Design an enzyme around this catalytic site. Structure first.
Site, PDB file in Angstrom:
ATOM      1  N   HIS A  28     103.899  57.973  75.530  1.00  0.00           N
ATOM      2  CA  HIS A  28     105.317  57.981  75.172  1.00  0.00           C
ATOM      3  C   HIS A  28     105.641  58.627  73.826  1.00  0.00           C
ATOM      4  CE1 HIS A  28     104.738  53.942  73.133  1.00  0.00           C
ATOM      5  NE2 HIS A  28     105.623  54.480  72.312  1.00  0.00           N
ATOM      6  N   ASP A  66     100.089  54.604  79.837  1.00  0.00           N
ATOM      7  CA  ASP A  66     100.590  55.067  78.548  1.00  0.00           C
ATOM      8  C   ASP A  66      99.452  55.459  77.606  1.00  0.00           C
ATOM      9  OD1 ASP A  66     102.374  55.730  76.560  1.00  0.00           O
ATOM     10  OD2 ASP A  66     103.057  53.690  76.159  1.00  0.00           O
ATOM     11  N   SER A 100     103.591  52.308  67.669  1.00  0.00           N
ATOM     12  CA  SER A 100     103.227  52.864  68.974  1.00  0.00           C
ATOM     13  C   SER A 100     102.129  53.907  68.878  1.00  0.00           C
ATOM     14  CB  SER A 100     104.456  53.497  69.639  1.00  0.00           C
ATOM     15  OG  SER A 100     105.447  52.523  69.896  1.00  0.00           O
ATOM     16  N   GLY A 101     101.142  53.796  69.767  1.00  0.00           N
ATOM     17  CA  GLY A 101     100.033  54.740  69.786  1.00  0.00           C
ATOM     18  C   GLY A 101      98.879  54.356  68.887  1.00  0.00           C
TER      19      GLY A 101
END
Length: 232
Positions: free
Chosen positions: A41, A86, A182-183
């Protein structure tokens, strides 16, 4: 990171910050001298490698070292806005030397077993609260692995957690990853004090909400995919 603390240089050497046009947007993890693993994402809207840069160390400000991105690989089965699969890989423009302050994490074999109740750590430059802005200094938070069944209960995620996902945090809230994290990495240590990447910060219902733990991409479930794309 919500409910965390600032870290010292060298504590989490594999942490990376992904910046688009010089602004932090996502975390990533160094898995090889030229490879980073992150979330799919992070590259949904901004996908031009030339405008992405990666930095290492505990600060975004006086970055110890920066690298450009040569290529971005998103999982074939990932489909926005869905959260399944993801995961992404980013190849660096040039190798990063292994030092005490910057080096790769170990990847678990597909059969590695992380047990519910295990103490893990999530790190990132993300928001301190819902709708907050990213921080300049790296933070860490201690979380606990929550079994998928409990995470899938009606009051929790009600069957939305797939086998490519993992849940970690606290049912009472207090600590959790947030926007901007995120990530990034979710790691745990084995008896030899060697750190392994258990998950990738993926999603959640807001941040640090009771009964809504953080959701992470399960590394063991996508371990072979990583090998198929990198040879690692």
């Amino acid at each position: 990171i919500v409910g965390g603390t600032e870290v010292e240089e060298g504590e989490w050497p594999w942490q990376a910050s992904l910046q688009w046009d010089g602004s932090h947007r996502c975390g990533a993890t160094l898995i090889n001298a030229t490879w980073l693993v992150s979330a799919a994402h992070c590259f949904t809207t901004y996908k031009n490698p030339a405008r992405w840069t990666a930095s290492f160390g505990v600060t975004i400000k006086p970055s110890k070292m920066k690298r450009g991105l040569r290529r971005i690989i998103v999982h074939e089965k990932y489909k926005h806005p869905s959260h399944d699969y993801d995961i992404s890989l980013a190849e660096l423009s040039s190798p990063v030397p292994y030092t005490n302050a910057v080096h790769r994490v170990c990847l678990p074999d597909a059969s590695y077993e992380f047990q519910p109740g295990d103490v893990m750590f999530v790190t990132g430059f993300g928001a301190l609260k819902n709708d907050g802005y990213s921080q300049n200094h790296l933070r860490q938070a201690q979380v606990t692995l929550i079994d998928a069944t409990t995470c899938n209960e009606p009051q929790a995620y009600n069957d939305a957690i797939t086998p490519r996902m993992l849940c970690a945090g606290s049912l009472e809230g207090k600590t959790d990853a947030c926007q901007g994290d995120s990530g990034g990495p979710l790691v745990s240590s084995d008896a030899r004090d060697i750190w392994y990447l258990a998950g990738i910060v993926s999603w959640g219902d807001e941040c640090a909400k009771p009964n809504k733990p953080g959701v992470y991409t399960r590394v063991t479930a996508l371990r072979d995919w990583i090998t198929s794309k990198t040879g690692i």
